[PDB]
């Protein structure tokens, strides 16, 4: 009877449900919250606009929010990241979802718009859950009136947080936000170990290439680049790392990687002469992890070893100059989300040409495009943080507060450490791990409560 | 020159040979020498220093002096001095009071020799400390000296805790820099230094194969992380204990099984609480916490026969060695290696099978049984120390009026720009090449091309 | 052309795109293709082939054809075919009978379609086999065909065992080359292939996080070595079981804890013999043995709820799946992934917590749930296959007098010189540069500058 | 008792304490000691022994004696003796001629003291050798003594090569057991021993950080495999050179870049052939080959300033140290650590930057700068030694009829069943539990339930 959705194939729903039932068993923090808060219905009356990869893991998040009282309207934040069986299962449960794997850019924008509008008019949304900031931007630029009713935004990822902080600095942010990314059980779990799991996964599914013994260049060594570099090194790749941040570069050196630049002496003057052609001519795989623009540029692409794989695991595709490749080189689809890019010219290629690159997911997030992103047991931490953040901001009721109280509360904050610890404890118990309890004397000795928090807010883990 | 006490002054030439090698391994620190030599930013500084008198500390001391400082130096541990390093410093005409194998009485005497010159308080105006013993003695016994001191630069996590307690209680008299929490210290020294030096010390003390054996690491902060890797990389099967669930989550994700010595994780002080099956399979226990009694008497009783026991946290009370001294017979194998015979206190059978091996009498094992962290890692810590000394000395806290002092009294870290400057020199030391952002890229992510590259919230 | 049966011929263009990529990843095999094209050493060869119909096997098949052979092909496992590879081979005019998800009846039919052409035995004169099923069918059901066959080239450990048993019993009718025991096969494919593809298949089937979880690997031969590394490198806590103490020693030294499913290692057939405490903590069990019932009914009953069970040895009887079919309810998650509900046979609760996850119905998991070994590894195995086909075809066993046959009826390996030549091409494929001995150095160690470099005793 | 020469007999108590610990780490060897003590299988054996006089060798010597043998012992390297081990052996009344830091003349004298007792040949009837120097001296200088010798048991790869050359040339006078090629020797000692002890020795000699730096390992046999892992596990970026393409393939698959010191691998003897760009980035070079001049004069000229150079193959001629002695100035840092100044022969500037660091004067670095392999690894090697001595002594070659001698003049290995029995004791030492086959399983794979478990072709 329910028709308020658009997915690839509703008949995938039973398969999706089987996978959701398995995922629930892999997500003890999130399911623990579901069990803890079900009675109290802390999200009763919440109307959440959600924009995040419509995977199985996101399904467990959505059904947790609903189980706690929320209504939601959902879209994916990437054209290739949906798992169609997950979308089907959510739609089959009577939840509005607009998402499929392999959207066009026009379809992507349309799906976000279907969450925002219900029956042609703005939905009475009062909460936002976002990954990367596209939904947040559309609301501020095109639907500013809807933000008058919204209590908060809970933002998943580093890039989205940057965008929020810029808005706050400029006075254009209209509702408070929680930076979910910077929970330790998000940033130092999902961003790092998630990519460790899923980068090599995606490259194998796309190419079935042996990785051992081959040369990789990882651009960036933040949380994603750390995890990515390990994904490849643990397979036996000879990994080199590029960075602009000398502290992150120091970490790469100490971690056993050679730190190099694509450019002579690190200076990117925009000319072919600046490219270290000797270095790039030996690289079999380049992975971008930065959240920055044009870190695998046209001249680097021209210089790469024949038959190198090129992919991006940062949030947005402009890390690699794919526009240059579309303008100048011929694309041969191997299979979905795997293209050979023939450097011999624009139109026409020889089927047996040797001078090509392999691009994964058209430069979009490769882990989600060519595989299934992070595994449930890792996403458990990120998504338990999301639920806690939604509860906190919904309960604070920003949209209803007096102006002076709003002025005090308009901020981008993180969750308290106590809650980060509580999420982590459930994760550890999920592994069968046992956390020791401090004695009262030990807790006094190091100056903490037996119940935590166990570290000062300055601590970096 | 006679204003020193070392084991053997004739070791000085050997020490100098090692200092010359260490300088080549310490580009950040040597770079500071070249950068600041002309300006002499520490001219007039009189620094009381208390930190492990190793070759690495030698290069630190000579850097401070090269920048204009005078110093008076002691070690912060009874077993951590390298006698050739101490000799070389004494031979350069610098007051140093330090040798490997001090008694506790000698340790206290050496600190006192830095504080006093010719029987009266030295006109000290700066403090460099590792662990807080010198800082405590100044506050408790020589409070008048703190009236002239511009600041304290503290090396290690335990010392920082002690400073923060003072600040909370309003008893801290001078500002401090928490040198530990530079990323180029905490996430370099504490982690990778222990990775290098823990397995080193265990091999020197015992020459035991580590591969295939079972280890329990107590703690998974920076030292526990590095320690766990030191052992895992050798092929140990490592289990980790933690009180902090976030650190425990990291251990799980890093590929370790997380266990408690105690049933249900509850340390009720009884033998019944001990997981005897677990402890009876452990070949090596390492404490990394900065806490007290984390390898306790009941754990020691339950350990597998012939297990090795050591501590790499700052102080020896991590292990209940007092219990062992009271109850069990100690057989010295060689210096800093004892068999502890669990058969009783009154002698031992030379062929007894029921013993534990304790390294460095439970004191910092990396420094006690080997040489601590390597020069290229200490480069980062000690470049931060020099910069911290400069920062606080230049700010001249001791010259402000009391109301202005009250506003300026803090425990702070160095600014990120300086942490980055140290890191860059470390990276160039490896032959690493850092990429420069284009103006468009710097705009895109909202940073200067010169840095800093991360918000102060960033955890690396 | 209609002499084939595949899932979907329209997948052929996709398969060809992947073959063109695979050729670039297989320098040893494509080097042989180019080298022997002129000579046509397999002109007149009529090869019955039974081996997983993957993209890699496609490159092998097209190499044999390029060297003059005709072939008729089937897969040696019901789940191992890549349908696009089969399509591409069929589209090239080569008889192939293979698809992913065959029934056992279909599997036997496909082998029979290779053996028969137009309802009568094909005039086969060569056999290429993986695991021995084709070899067995010829000996048992078509013995007259073996009168014309010059040899068998056998890919895998299990098939070689079966050949050696036949030879011992006097029932082997044609000579064979053990391709498995080239170093560029056994110590490449069996080990590093499983390192690549075991974790691959578990991720594709389950998308389970592996880091931090407990695995038990049964066996520590070449496949168990590679499998254990596949899991450990992901951060699993891996325990290893073995019956061979030398292999167990290697596991210990490699950093694994060596355990038995049975108390004191004694499998008496009772539940009381099972180490239920150990098995109750295992999240993943992988069988690697080539043996029977190494993950038995009582082990399955004892495993932790929701454990994954899989087999990467050649045949499914490593795990007692027959017990599971008789007693427990199977819920298909998706193809080649079943939840096995331990609550009973007659239906299951969709929300039951007491289940195991079985991959590929206990068949070779790397090929069943992923794509098996990668091209650049299969390059070594399949270069050896081509060399072995050439050698046995050129020897012409079927034509020799009885006394000469008697001398030649054996199971042999390829010479070390050829193993080295394959390896050299593999190394150059990575961009590796092998040093050439000087004449003095070659004299010093007693080898030719060209090799072979090691005595036949050498184990690598 | 005076029939010995050691550095310092007063080290004996320390040595004994370490022997008591080593016995607890050597369960295979101590198991043989317990098993065979009653039967005294070496009663009447008079063994000339030449092998590194370490604590581990002490346990071997005392096992041979405990089984009835008399021995006369020397070290097979000038730097490998542990003086406390030598002292303890001498203090037990066993003839030993060994100290750390022998001259070449002293080394030859020590071997001669084993051969002669009171100025005339000892009535030796057995030889235990490591590297072949003793074996060579007997054949060249004391051939009459070989008439009464029943056999030689040879520890190491280089010594085995020398024996096989003798056999090929018809100059070998007594049979030998190649102890090296037991799996519990070659694939334990040669590989995992160097994994343990290479990084150990480099740390003790230099205290250099290894993580992040560039290494070149020359060779990828058993020692090169273990060596490469020693460095990679510390975080070095390791490149590997090889002449054997199969070993090079393994290095690639193991995650190393395979390179040559020479452009395109061609060593034409000129400076122009050296890849100066590659060598100018290497911080550490380690030779592992058993070959000559694999780190040659031109390579040494091209290495990065301040690179460490060492050898872990049996003999020092792997590195052209003679070139360095002729041309460059040596500055001793401390024992077994020299800076070699490339500025000229006649003196050096103490602050010169253009030097290399050579460890142990190019002699076996693990034994020279540390203590070699750990007891628990040497357990396997030395259990094999004891078994080999028993076998050859019981065979009584010297006393056999000539036709039987002709058949038995050979170089053989120990049976696989005994290799397995050694391994089982090693595994139990770790607390490992080996599973026992059921009768049906043993039938299925074609072995006895008690083993042996693999055919003699198996490479592990
Ligand atoms: N694919 C996934 O599943 C996933 C998971 C988490 C985060 N993300 C995304 O990944 C990106 C990175 O996130 P993060 O948490 O690691 O951020 P981060 O800020 O921790 O790290 C990014 C790094 O890129 C480096 N960098 C920037 N420009 C560079 C350049 N020109 N060359 C080399 N290095 C350069 C920075 O110095 C920094 O250390 C973001 O876009 C984030 O949203 C994706
Ligand atoms: N030996 C060295 O060279 C060296 C180097 C740096 C620091 N340190 C010292 O090592 C210690 C630890 O330093 P850090 O930087 O790792 O501090 P840290 O705060 O990062 O980590 C200590 C960890 O111990 C854990 N812990 C506390 N009590 C515990 C208990 N009862 N059981 C289990 N875990 C427990 C805490 O949760 C914490 O994660 C300090 O004493 C520091 O001064 C020594
Ligand atoms: N899936 C693949 O791609 C692939 C690749 C190569 C080989 N194989 C197959 O894998 C299997 C193993 O091949 P291999 O080359 O490793 O053989 P192998 O002989 O080297 O190793 C098998 C090991 O199993 C051990 N074992 C036997 N019974 C045992 C038991 N009850 N418990 C514990 N350990 C036991 C043996 O001691 C031996 O070490 C064979 O069936 C082979 O054909 C599969
Ligand atoms: N230090 C120790 O404790 C220790 C332990 C065991 C053995 N050894 C000694 O180590 C040496 C090696 O023993 P192994 O068992 O590894 O022998 P191996 O035959 O297994 O390996 C030696 C390797 O060196 C390679 N090689 C030869 N010449 C080369 C060259 N010019 N460039 C590059 N690679 C070259 C060979 O191809 C071979 O793979 C021998 O001298 C042996 O006696 C020392
Ligand atoms: N080689 C060394 N020289 C001086 N200090 C050291 C050395 N190794 C470790 N340390 C210091 O020991 C402290 C613990 O007391 C750490 O904070 C660390 O910086
Ligand atoms: K997933
Ligand atoms: K040091
Ligand atoms: K494949
Ligand atoms: K030793
Ligand atoms: Zn997003
Ligand atoms: Zn200290
Ligand atoms: Zn097969
Ligand atoms: Zn020797």
Residue numbers in the entry:
A (entry chain A): 9 to 469
B (entry chain B), C (entry chain C), D (entry chain D): 10 to 469
Task: Give the text the authors published on this PDB structure.
By hydrolyzing SAH to adenosine (Ado) and L-homocysteine (Hcy), the enzyme SAHase (SAH hydrolase) serves as an important regulator of SAM-dependent methylation through the control of the SAM:SAH ratio, and is an indicator of the biological methylation activity of the cell. SAHases are usually active as homotetramers. The protomer has a three-domain fold, with two prominent domains, the substrate- and cofactor-binding domains, separated by a deep crevice. A small C-terminal dimerization domain locks two subunits into a homodimer by quaternary complementation of the cofactor binding site, where a tightly but non-covalently bound nicotinamide adenine dinucleotide (NAD+) is found in its oxidized form.
